Structures are given as C-alpha cells and as structure tokens.
C-alpha cells in the first residue's frame, strides 16, 4: 500500500514501518520535518492577519458609503463576507492544526476546515459567474429594456450562496466527506478513496462538472459576448467613449478576478483530479500540501484586486480611513 487508509482518513505515507498514525489521533511529524509544520502555521497566521482586516475593511467601507450600491459593490461585499467565513470558520482551525501537527479537534475540526474553504472558493467561483453575466447584460444589453439593478444584486448574492452550499454542505451529511490532505493539516473533498457508503465517486464528478466546469462555461460564454461586442456589436450601441472608459475599468477588473481565480485554484484542481484518477498511486504529503495551502490565498486576493483596480472603491476607502477628506 502506497498510502494508509483508515476508517476516515488517507495518509499519503506507507505503513510498512508501522509509524503511520491517524491525523485525528496523533501528530504527523513522521510525514515531514516539524519546521515544515511551523511554516504552514506561520503561513496560516499571515493569511488570518491579512484576511481579517482587508475583508472587514472592504465590508465596513461598503456599508458606510451609500453610493456603493452597484452589482460589483454588492458582489465584492459578498466575497468580503465569504472570506471572513474562511478566515474565522476555517483558517483558525487549520492554523491550530498545523501547530499541533494534526486535527486535535478530530473530524469536527476537519469539517470546519474543509467546509469553509470549499464554501469560500465556490462563493468566489459563482460570484464570478454573476459578475460576468452582469457585465454581459450591462455591456451588450441583449435582453429587452431590462435593469440589472439593486434587486438583482441581492438575488445575485443569494444565488452564489445557494450554489456554493450545494457543493460544500452535502459532504457534511453523507455525500462524500471532508478528509485530511497532504501533511494532514488541511481538509478537502475525498478524492482519495471510493468509500461507496458516502458515494464518493459520484460527488467528485458532480463537483468538477457542476462546481467547476459549468461555471467556467458560463463565464467563457460571457467573455465571448464581450469580445464580440467590444468589437462590432458596440459601435452600433453608440457606447459613449466617456462611459466605456469607466465600464472598461470594471470589465478589465472582472477579467483579472477571473484570471486570479484560475491562478489560485487550478493547481489544486489538477492535483485533486489526478489523485482522483490515480487512487492508491504513490504520492507524498507534499503533493497536495502546496496547492491546497496556496489556494487558501483565495481568502485575500479579491479585496486587494478590488482596492487596486476600482478607483471609486479605493477613494472611498482612503476617505473612510482618513475620516472625511482623503464619500457616499
Ligand atoms: C503503488 O505505487 C507503485 C509504483 O510506485 C505501483 O506499482 C506499479 O504497478 C504497475 C502495475 O499497475 C507495474 O507495472 C507492471 O510492470 C511489470 C514489469 O515487471 C509488467 O510486466 C506489467 O505488465 C506492468 O506493466 C509497475 O512496475 C509498478 N511499479 C513498481 C516499481 O512497483 C502500484 O500500482 C501502486 N499501488 C499499489 C498496487 O500498491
Ligand atoms: C501502522 O502499523 C502499526 C503497527 O505496525 C499499527 O499500529 C499497531 O496496531 C496494532 C493493531 O491494532 C496494535 O496492536 C494491539 O495489540 C493489542 C494486544 O494487547 C490488542 O488488544 C489490540 O486490539 C491491538 O491489536 C498495536 O498496538 C499498534 N502498534 C503500535 C503501538 O504502534 C497502525 O495502526 C498502522 N497505521 C494505521 C493507523 O493504519
Ligand atoms: C456550518 C457548518 C459547520 C461544519 C461543522 C461540522 C462538524 C460536524 O462534524 C462532526 C462529525 O462529523 C463527521 C462526519 O463527516
Ligand atoms: C450561439 C449558440 C452557441 C453557444 C453554445 C455554448 C454554450 C452556451 O451555454 C452557456 C449559457 O449561456
Ligand atoms: C501546479 C502544480 C502544483 C504546484 C503548486 C503551486 C504553488 C504556487 O506557488 C506559489 C508558492 O506559494 C505557496 C506557499 O504555500 C505553501 C505554504
Ligand atoms: C510535461 C507533462 C506531460 C504529461 C501530460 C500527461 C497527460 C495525460 O492526459 C491525462 C488527462 O488529464 C488532463 C490534463 O493532463 C495533465 C496531467 O495529466 C494527469 C491527469 O490528472
Ligand atoms: C493590502 C492593500 C494595499 C493597497 C493600498 C492602496 C491604498 C491607496 O493607494 C494609493 C495610490 O494612489 C493611486 C491612485 O489612487 C487614486 C488617488 O489619486
Ligand atoms: C485549504 C483547503 C482546501 C483547499 C479545501 C477544499 C477545497 C475544495 C473542495 C475545492 C473545490 C474547488 C473549488 C473551490 C474551485 C475550483 C474547483 C474545485 C472543485 C477543486
Ligand atoms: C475536470 C478536470 C480539470 C483538471 C484541471 C487540471 C489543471 C492542471 C494543474 C496541474 C495538474 C498536473 N499534475 C499531474 C501534476 O497534477
Ligand atoms: Zn433591479
């Protein structure tokens, strides 16, 4: 056996030397150097100390400024909340797990870490869908005399929560399950075992198809409509050069957010898909540790892209932080 399966775990280390233990029962220092566990800990600590203030700040600045009530403003507020859930719901646990080198909080700890990570990632993915569609509607206005206003914004946000929970929750109640990965200090979906009792196989398929591929199809479609229009379907829409310059700011930003997501999550995606199609194969704990922990920057990069690429949000922020002068 290249790894060590247990009732509820899969250590990617051979147990021929009898050293393997359950990531729920004892430290995993046999897996790698303890200074590496300190690196993860240190890492999570930074993510928490960065993620807590940039998200809250985003959330706070948005609420405080009434003029910040467009679909973008709404979507980014939504991410800010999603990220605070990742930070406080998940990262605190992954931090503490890294410090002890195992899930001292047992499977309940693992569920927290896996849930909020999955939730935050998916909320970001589906939010991208809502934005692309909003860019589509606002930049090409295909449907009739329609208004993607505040009302749809709310419906947009609720929508992201629905899809994301459709992915993150089922493994909490019997469809697949959260399971330790890599050095055993973070938890992901079970790509590792078939465990037919929780119908693992069918969940992983559902996840990759509905919670990765489909959303990418939708965004790709929208991206199609925008390239086309910015080309020859907009010169007939008489888009005044004055609005386009502000609607191109926002369009560029969404595109960057989409690229950042791919940069952040594809590596995890690939390893997961690999493991899934090579169960039992010989891979170490480092194979998934790097992509998994890297993906956790998803809790941080969005508000930063926001601050850096949306002048209106930026100015409001400086205003909030400087009190009065640097508004809404
Ligand atoms: C655990 O990992 C090892 C690799 O580290 C996997 O073992 C590999 O298994 C394949 C078959 O699935 C072996 O291929 C066979 O090679 C012989 C040559 O003697 C050939 O006649 C067969 O037709 C076939 O091609 C491969 O050699 C083997 N690698 C080694 C060196 O062990 C294994 O599948 C993984 N899981 C298990 C079973 O523990
Ligand atoms: C990796 O292999 C090691 C041993 O190579 C596994 O740990 C060992 O597990 C055995 C069987 O559970 C333990 O033996 C116990 O013996 C008493 C006899 O009084 C019996 O009453 C128990 O039911 C049990 O059979 C043994 O203590 C333990 N060895 C130690 C101390 O490490 C280990 O479980 C394997 N990794 C995993 C968790 O898959
Ligand atoms: C709001 C979601 C919080 C998730 C907490 C899950 C903790 C329950 O786990 C206890 C045992 O469940 C293990 C089965 O998987
Ligand atoms: C012009 C029709 C061909 C488009 C097929 C691509 C898939 C579109 O589905 C995405 C939903 O919008
Ligand atoms: C795509 C193949 C897997 C390689 C992982 C990509 C990692 C991105 O490198 C950036 C380094 O930051 C990772 C630090 O997190 C680990 C602690
Ligand atoms: C230098 C990399 C060459 C190895 C490429 C292997 C391609 C095997 O096709 C499998 C299809 O998987 C999708 C993308 O492939 C990337 C790695 O494949 C591993 C499968 O998870
Ligand atoms: C961790 C996030 C760091 C982002 C800092 C951004 C703060 C504002 O930057 C000021 C740069 O000013 C350039 C354009 O701002 C418009 C004001 O003129
Ligand atoms: C640090 C902990 C992590 C990364 C735990 C779990 C992550 C997932 C189950 C991720 C799922 C996916 C997302 C969020 C978006 C890209 C596709 C996906 C299905 C791999
Ligand atoms: C539905 C399939 C999606 C798979 C996405 C794959 C992205 C590639 C990322 C690196 C994976 C390569 N590998 C084998 C080292 O894991
Ligand atoms: Zn409306």
Numbering used by the authors: 1 to 326, 330 to 331
Quoted from the paper:
In the original crystallographic analysis of the ground-state molecule, the choice of space-group symmetry, i.e. trigonal versus hexagonal, was made mostly on the basis of a reduced κ = 60° peak in the native rotation function. After the structure was solved, the original authors revisited the space-group assignment. The possibility of the structure being in space group P62 was considered and rejected. No consideration of P64 is described in the original structure reports. Because the symmetry operations in P31 are a subset of those in P64, the crystal structures of both rhodopsins can be successfully refined in that space group. The model refined in P64 was obtained by superposing the two molecules from the P31 asymmetric unit and retaining the solvent, detergent and additive molecules common to both. Translation of the model also was necessary to align the threefold screw axes in the two space groups. The refinement behavior and statistics for both molecules indicate that space group P64 provides an appropriate description of these crystal structures. The protein molecules in each crystal structure are in identical environments (as far as the X-ray experiment is concerned) and not in two different environments as implied by the models in space group P31. The two crystal structures still differ in the packing interactions between helices 5 in neighboring molecules that are now related by crystallographic symmetry operations rather than by noncrystallographic operations in space group P31.
Owing to their importance in many signal transduction pathways, G protein-coupled receptors (GPCRs) are target molecules for important therapeutic compounds. Rhodopsin, one of the visual pigments in the retina, was the first GPCR to have its crystal structure determined. The structures of ground-state bovine rhodopsin and of one of its recombinant mutants (N2C/D282C) have been solved in space group P31 with two molecules in the asymmetric unit. While investigating the nature of this non-isomorphism, it became apparent that the crystal structures could also be described in space group P64 with one molecule in the asymmetric unit.
